[PDB]
Design an enzyme around this catalytic site. Structure first.
Site, PDB file in Angstrom:
ATOM      1  N   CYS B 108       0.782  -1.241   0.000  1.00 59.24           N
ATOM      2  CA  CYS B 108       0.000   0.000   0.000  1.00 59.24           C
ATOM      3  C   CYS B 108       0.802   1.274   0.000  1.00 59.24           C
ATOM      4  O   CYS B 108       1.461   1.645   1.004  1.00 59.24           O
ATOM      5  CB  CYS B 108      -1.067   0.022   1.119  1.00 59.24           C
ATOM      6  SG  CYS B 108      -2.064   1.508   1.130  1.00 59.24           S
ATOM      7  N   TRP B 280      -9.400   6.158  -1.274  1.00 56.97           N
ATOM      8  CA  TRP B 280      -9.686   6.853  -2.534  1.00 56.97           C
ATOM      9  C   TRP B 280      -8.671   6.406  -3.621  1.00 56.97           C
ATOM     10  O   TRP B 280      -7.686   5.763  -3.318  1.00 56.97           O
ATOM     11  CB  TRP B 280      -9.655   8.367  -2.390  1.00 56.97           C
ATOM     12  CG  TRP B 280      -8.429   8.951  -1.680  1.00 56.97           C
ATOM     13  CD1 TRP B 280      -7.174   9.210  -2.224  1.00 56.97           C
ATOM     14  CD2 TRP B 280      -8.352   9.317  -0.316  1.00 56.97           C
ATOM     15  NE1 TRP B 280      -6.336   9.720  -1.252  1.00 56.97           N
ATOM     16  CE2 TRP B 280      -7.036   9.811  -0.075  1.00 56.97           C
ATOM     17  CE3 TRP B 280      -9.272   9.303   0.739  1.00 56.97           C
ATOM     18  CZ2 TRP B 280      -6.630  10.275   1.178  1.00 56.97           C
ATOM     19  CZ3 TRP B 280      -8.868   9.766   1.989  1.00 56.97           C
ATOM     20  CH2 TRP B 280      -7.557  10.265   2.193  1.00 56.97           C
ATOM     21  N   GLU B 285      -4.581   3.709 -11.127  1.00 57.43           N
ATOM     22  CA  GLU B 285      -5.417   2.515 -10.976  1.00 57.43           C
ATOM     23  C   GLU B 285      -6.499   2.435 -12.072  1.00 57.43           C
ATOM     24  O   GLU B 285      -6.657   1.377 -12.679  1.00 57.43           O
ATOM     25  CB  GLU B 285      -6.100   2.410  -9.618  1.00 57.43           C
ATOM     26  CG  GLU B 285      -5.137   2.323  -8.448  1.00 57.43           C
ATOM     27  CD  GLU B 285      -5.910   2.290  -7.129  1.00 57.43           C
ATOM     28  OE1 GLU B 285      -6.506   1.239  -6.857  1.00 57.43           O
ATOM     29  OE2 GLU B 285      -5.902   3.274  -6.376  1.00 57.43           O
TER      30      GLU B 285
HETATM   31  C1  HEM Z   1      -6.589   6.281   1.518  1.00 51.68           C
HETATM   32  C2  HEM Z   1      -6.236   6.208   0.238  1.00 51.68           C
HETATM   33  C3  HEM Z   1      -5.468   5.061  -0.279  1.00 51.68           C
HETATM   34  C4  HEM Z   1      -4.694   5.057  -1.413  1.00 51.68           C
HETATM   35  C5  HEM Z   1      -4.447   6.220  -2.387  1.00 51.68           C
HETATM   36  C6  HEM Z   1      -4.189   3.733  -1.525  1.00 51.68           C
HETATM   37  C7  HEM Z   1      -3.360   3.323  -2.576  1.00 51.68           C
HETATM   38  C8  HEM Z   1      -3.180   1.961  -2.827  1.00 51.68           C
HETATM   39  C9  HEM Z   1      -2.905   1.419  -4.122  1.00 51.68           C
HETATM   40  C10 HEM Z   1      -2.764   2.248  -5.377  1.00 51.68           C
HETATM   41  C11 HEM Z   1      -2.736   0.076  -3.958  1.00 51.68           C
HETATM   42  C12 HEM Z   1      -2.428  -0.966  -5.018  1.00 51.68           C
HETATM   43  C13 HEM Z   1      -3.769  -1.375  -5.660  1.00 51.68           C
HETATM   44  C14 HEM Z   1      -3.595  -2.313  -6.831  1.00 51.68           C
HETATM   45  O1  HEM Z   1      -2.735  -2.118  -7.728  1.00 51.68           O
HETATM   46  O2  HEM Z   1      -4.330  -3.319  -6.899  1.00 51.68           O
HETATM   47  C15 HEM Z   1      -2.975  -0.211  -2.580  1.00 51.68           C
HETATM   48  C16 HEM Z   1      -2.872  -1.485  -2.027  1.00 51.68           C
HETATM   49  C17 HEM Z   1      -3.394  -1.788  -0.765  1.00 51.68           C
HETATM   50  N1  HEM Z   1      -3.884  -0.902   0.146  1.00 51.68           N
HETATM   51 FE1  HEM Z   1      -4.167   0.971  -0.133  1.00 51.68          FE
HETATM   52  N2  HEM Z   1      -4.552   2.988  -0.464  1.00 51.68           N
HETATM   53  C18 HEM Z   1      -5.414   3.685   0.298  1.00 51.68           C
HETATM   54  C19 HEM Z   1      -6.119   3.276   1.457  1.00 51.68           C
HETATM   55  C20 HEM Z   1      -6.159   1.981   1.987  1.00 51.68           C
HETATM   56  C21 HEM Z   1      -7.020   1.532   2.997  1.00 51.68           C
HETATM   57  C22 HEM Z   1      -8.106   2.357   3.663  1.00 51.68           C
HETATM   58  C23 HEM Z   1      -6.675   0.227   3.262  1.00 51.68           C
HETATM   59  C24 HEM Z   1      -7.280  -0.688   4.266  1.00 51.68           C
HETATM   60  C25 HEM Z   1      -7.681  -0.229   5.481  1.00 51.68           C
HETATM   61  C26 HEM Z   1      -5.621  -0.118   2.370  1.00 51.68           C
HETATM   62  C27 HEM Z   1      -4.955  -1.322   2.325  1.00 51.68           C
HETATM   63  C28 HEM Z   1      -4.300  -1.702   1.161  1.00 51.68           C
HETATM   64  C29 HEM Z   1      -3.938  -3.114   0.979  1.00 51.68           C
HETATM   65  C30 HEM Z   1      -4.163  -4.281   1.967  1.00 51.68           C
HETATM   66  C31 HEM Z   1      -3.339  -3.166  -0.231  1.00 51.68           C
HETATM   67  C32 HEM Z   1      -2.743  -4.425  -0.901  1.00 51.68           C
HETATM   68  C33 HEM Z   1      -3.801  -5.071  -1.798  1.00 51.68           C
HETATM   69  C34 HEM Z   1      -3.387  -6.331  -2.498  1.00 51.68           C
HETATM   70  O3  HEM Z   1      -2.381  -7.022  -2.180  1.00 51.68           O
HETATM   71  O4  HEM Z   1      -4.127  -6.704  -3.439  1.00 51.68           O
HETATM   72  N3  HEM Z   1      -5.292   0.975   1.635  1.00 51.68           N
HETATM   73  N4  HEM Z   1      -3.175   0.972  -1.867  1.00 51.68           N
HETATM   74  N1  M87 Z   2      -6.988   3.077  -3.876  1.00 57.69           N
HETATM   75  C1  M87 Z   2      -6.914   1.815  -3.383  1.00 57.69           C
HETATM   76  C2  M87 Z   2      -6.837   1.553  -2.018  1.00 57.69           C
HETATM   77  C3  M87 Z   2      -6.739   0.245  -1.512  1.00 57.69           C
HETATM   78  C4  M87 Z   2      -6.741  -0.836  -2.405  1.00 57.69           C
HETATM   79  C5  M87 Z   2      -6.635  -2.165  -1.950  1.00 57.69           C
HETATM   80  C6  M87 Z   2      -6.689  -3.219  -2.896  1.00 57.69           C
HETATM   81  C7  M87 Z   2      -6.797  -2.923  -4.253  1.00 57.69           C
HETATM   82  C8  M87 Z   2      -6.934  -3.996  -5.312  1.00 57.69           C
HETATM   83  N2  M87 Z   2      -5.933  -5.000  -5.423  1.00 57.69           N
HETATM   84  C9  M87 Z   2      -6.196  -5.973  -6.479  1.00 57.69           C
HETATM   85  C10 M87 Z   2      -5.049  -6.948  -6.487  1.00 57.69           C
HETATM   86  C11 M87 Z   2      -5.178  -8.162  -7.374  1.00 57.69           C
HETATM   87  C12 M87 Z   2      -5.663  -8.128  -8.693  1.00 57.69           C
HETATM   88  C13 M87 Z   2      -5.726  -9.305  -9.451  1.00 57.69           C
HETATM   89  C14 M87 Z   2      -5.292 -10.501  -8.875  1.00 57.69           C
HETATM   90  C15 M87 Z   2      -4.796 -10.518  -7.556  1.00 57.69           C
HETATM   91  F1  M87 Z   2      -4.364 -11.652  -6.968  1.00 57.69           F
HETATM   92  C16 M87 Z   2      -4.740  -9.347  -6.810  1.00 57.69           C
HETATM   93  C17 M87 Z   2      -6.922  -1.597  -4.684  1.00 57.69           C
HETATM   94  C18 M87 Z   2      -6.854  -0.545  -3.763  1.00 57.69           C
HETATM   95  N3  M87 Z   2      -6.934   0.751  -4.219  1.00 57.69           N
END
Ligand code: HEM
Ligand code: M87
Ligand code: HEM
Ligand code: M87
Ligand code: H4B
Ligand code: H4B
Ligand code: ZN
Lengths: 407, 411
Positions: B108, B280, B285
């Protein structure tokens, strides 16, 4: 023990077995991944020689033949007797090609079997090294139709008789810290430029001064030489649409020729092994031109484009980045100097990975290096899972000679 | 043991000690790095140490470590475990756990925000209609008419693994995908399988390019039930470009609220299999991945066609050119409609400041470079040049198998 890599764009799954051969360590543990870190005697030598000759004789379908056993015996006798050994030409060529084949950070490895190997093991002096290097430069350059080559100087002995090229690439531009505060030329090369100056080079103190070669033969003190200017092919950088681009005064050289690495074959160490291929456009246009710590020209280009530099969210950097990279590719192509774009290079690499999985059981690949520094997810390598591991023969980093050398 | 990371642009060197608190494994060994692999019923025995370690972290954070309240809490949890075989978190510990799972999320980039998270406690929820109501309230709260607020809603934890709460949707708001007889897809190809499940369950599909999917909600291990989010709660942004007037005619829009709903939250050994959360968007994305991945909406060709770029050679960089224009469009549209969004320059820069803060105050910040670096313009963002250490801390968000692969259907 048998490992799967998946391509998430195409669902193609490949199975890796080659990693089980892996010998050297990664930097990672079960508790911590170091994937993004830039740099993570007689008794020892015979196992290394054996493992190498085993794979060599395997590659020519003569594993367990008398020729195989004889050579193992012969090298063993030579190690016992002399504490080192000499590679046959055939082994040296195989070794060098395989070091490239095994380079997990190199996207251009589809080419690996077409490598011209120049055997410079008979070299004894720095003037000799200069001669070999000019010949490599001219051969590889080939008037713009670039050919991959390596020149291999004598192997380390007792390590107080090392051959080294002090330069990081055969052709690079000088960098000078200014009395005012800024940097003229290439900031990456300030310290090397200073070493040249301190050794006696007279710098013309411009933005794009081709550095002199600083060559060390046989553990001796390194010496300076100027590559004949006529052997250094350079490209003026213009844009196919922006007439003002040329006024920026940008040029780059055609031949990327890395000269500071160490080639390890069958436990033998080649501390001077300059090698060259050709450029992927992003190396110059994204990294050389736009790294904040490099020529850092994004600001100037954006201005000339009259973009809204007020807010990061106008994506003015991104717009200017694309244009710079269009111009690099256009300039090399217009002058008929081999260059590859990042779309073509990564597509080739996906094909190469499939070839290697199919023919060798895998392909070590470092995703952090292989995905291009712009437009990552629009290249197919972005969506490709990769397994990174260390195979020998290999290219390795070594510390810069000036920290090591005893004068 | 101390571990150093270097930024190769600034030469700033940081020292990591936090990695010493990491228990879970990475996938990597001394012989292989699995850093680019996408994805690399507890007994009482294993539960008390997980609870103990968590409560030790909680009590330290409140500067009450070793206090009488700390000790009485450990004893009360321990008795509750060997008697009931599980335990309930206090509201304060739930809040702390949900924030830390975010703090610890190495993929993240938006973690600078981790301490501002609205936690909705839905542990008293019992039915799918109950879940629907919680989720609507989450959406309306988080949306806040465009001024987005981060939030998480936490449904009851796993008990025997036969009574799981699950949201079948991968995000609360997502568009349908329809595989056509000719093999083309209408709508979002990522969601074809899930769309098919919804239809089978009885959803009447409008069959357009941007149909908001229904929620498929599972309470207490029962078969999931379908519900339509009130459309007035689904905020959407039509996409237009600041200079190119034909851009609107591409017919594109996207939803404002990214709300991931298929992850599992682990706190002190407890497993919350339904814990939808939202923040947000970072612009890339939508503009890079959702719009331009070949396996998604895949709009690169049509956009570059309309821009009349030279498309006969990849070396014109027509794709890279169209990519930037689409991404300018996404940011412009969201900003113009006053819906929260962050660009990848701002977001990565904020992340670097967050990471340095974390090193100073926490002793580390686990980060996955492969995910943190944006999918366009990688090296002109400061994270590209930043060395990162990836390791796993708890509380954490984890993947879980899609529920349709594992659900025992009641009928
Ligand atoms: C507040 C604004 C936030 C922004 C701009 C942001 C940005 C991002 C982005 C761009 C990703 C990668 C998404 C992808 O390519 O699939 C991500 C991953 C993640 N974020 Fe955030 N994030 C935010 C808030 C949060 C919140 C609220 C949570 C949970 C409470 C969170 C937990 C995660 C987790 C667990 C991942 C990893 C997801 C995965 O492995 O698929 N984030 N974040
Ligand atoms: N802006 C944000 C914030 C938190 C997020 C947390 C999770 C994600 C989505 N992640 C998708 C990851 C994924 C895609 C496809 C296959 C896979 F195994 C895993 C997007 C988010 N975007
Ligand atoms: C033929 C054209 C070639 C192309 C297009 C190419 C492409 C690349 C690129 C883009 C890199 C990344 C370098 C960086 O970002 O600094 C790289 C790394 C590398 N390539 Fe190549 N390559 C080519 C030929 C060669 C040859 C001929 C060799 C050796 C015989 C080689 C060995 C390597 C090694 C060892 C690295 C890693 C360097 C390091 O760790 O610093 N490549 N390749
Ligand atoms: N086109 C090519 C082909 C082979 C290459 C082989 C090596 C390189 C340059 N790699 C240097 C990377 C580097 C930069 C700075 C510090 C460091 F440790 C390492 C560029 C190449 N370009
Ligand atoms: C910190 C990080 O590992 C470093 O910036 C890397 C990232 N990926 C790279 N990839 C390539 N091809 N070349 C590089 O110099 C780098 N630098
Ligand atoms: C194979 C590779 O690990 C995979 O495509 C990853 C790369 N980096 C990513 N980074 C982010 N933020 N999101 C992703 O979906 C991916 N995909
Ligand atoms: Zn690793």
């Amino acid at each position: 023990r048998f490992l799967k890599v998946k391509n998430w764009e195409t669902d193609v799954v490949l199975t890796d077995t080659l990693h089980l051969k892996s010998t050297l360590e990664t930097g990672c543990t079960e508790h911590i991944c170091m994937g993004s870190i830039m740099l993570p005697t007689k008794d020892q030598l015979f196992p290394l020689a054996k493992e190498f000759l085993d794979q060599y004789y395997s590659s020519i379908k003569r594993f367990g033949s008398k020729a195989h056993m004889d050579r193992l015996e012969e090298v063993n006798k030579e190690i016992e007797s002399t504490s080192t050994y000499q590679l046959k030409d055939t082994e040296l060529i195989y070794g060098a090609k395989h070091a490239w084949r095994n380079a997990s950070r190199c996207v251009g490895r589809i080419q690996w079997s077409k490598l011209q190997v120049f055997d410079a093991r008979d070299c004894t002096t720095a003037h000799g090294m200069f001669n070999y290097i000019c010949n490599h430069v001219k051969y590889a350059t080939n008037k713009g139709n670039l050919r991959s080559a390596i020149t291999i100087f004598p192997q380390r002995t007792d390590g107080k008789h090392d051959f080294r090229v002090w330069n990081s690439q055969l052709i690079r531009y000088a960098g000078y810290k200014q009395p005012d505060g800024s940097t003229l030329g290439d900031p990456a090369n300030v310290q090397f430029t200073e070493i040249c100056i301190q050794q006696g080079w007279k710098a013309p103190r411009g933005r794009f001064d081709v550095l002199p070669l600083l060559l060390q033969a046989n553990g001796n003190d390194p010496e300076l030489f100027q590559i004949p200017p006529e052997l250094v092919l350079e490209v003026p950088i213009r844009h196919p649409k922006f007439d003002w681009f040329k006024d920026l005064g940008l040029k780059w050289y055609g031949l990327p020729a890395v000269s500071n690495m160490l080639l390890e074959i069958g436990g033998l160490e080649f501390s001077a092994c300059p090698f060259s291929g050709w450029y992927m456009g992003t190396e110059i246009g994204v990294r050389d031109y736009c790294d904040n710590s490099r020529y850092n020209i994004l600001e100037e280009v954006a201005k000339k484009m009259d973009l809204d530099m007020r807010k990061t969210s106008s994506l003015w950097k991104d717009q200017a980045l694309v244009e710079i990279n269009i111009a690099v590719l256009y300039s090399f192509q217009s002058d008929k100097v081999t260059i590859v774009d990042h779309h073509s290079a990564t597509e080739s690499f996906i094909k190469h990975m499939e070839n290697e999985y199919r023919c060798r059981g895998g392909c070590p690949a470092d995703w952090v290096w292989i995905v291009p520094p712009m437009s990552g997810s629009i290249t197919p390598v972005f969506h490709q899972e990769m397994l990174n591991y260390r195979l020998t023969p290999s290219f390795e980093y070594q510390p810069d000679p000036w920290n090591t050398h005893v004068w």
